[PDB]
């Protein structure tokens, strides 16, 4: 069984646009996606296409780059570090669901490094 995604809009919480935040979209984003390793981050776990039951069982708060590209482009996000929260609780929820040395895991370890390198330096404000 699969919750409804997570929200990518919410009237009550205030929007703001950022340069970090425009280039988390453009650049951190946008460059991720194409990885070889991207797309079993690309959009929610659908539990019933993967037949994962536990996933959400397991996964409390889960996060995707597709909700994660939302957000951005709906600017839900009020700066750059909550946007990387997101991305951090993503690579959390793959080695919290999965098991060290998994293919997945290997996957978003991968994303993870590549990741960090390039929030390592944002733009300025
Ligand atoms: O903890 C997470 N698993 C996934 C996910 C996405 C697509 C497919 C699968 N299961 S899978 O096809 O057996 C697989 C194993 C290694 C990479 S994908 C998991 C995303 S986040």
Known sequence: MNP??????????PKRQTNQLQYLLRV?????WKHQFAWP??????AVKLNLPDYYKII???????????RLENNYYW?????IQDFN???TN???????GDDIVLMAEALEKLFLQKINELPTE
């Open 89 to 91: 609780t993503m690579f």
């Open 28 to 32: 951190v984003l946008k460059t991720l």
């Open 41 to 46: 981050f690309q959009q929610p776990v659908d």
């Open 60 to 70: 409390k708060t889960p996060m995707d780059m597709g909700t994660i590209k939302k």
């Open 4 to 13: 409804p995604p997570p929200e990518t809009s919410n009237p009550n919480k």
């Open 79 to 83: 700066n750059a570090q909550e946007c």
């Open 94 to 100: 793959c080695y919290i669901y999965n098991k060290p």
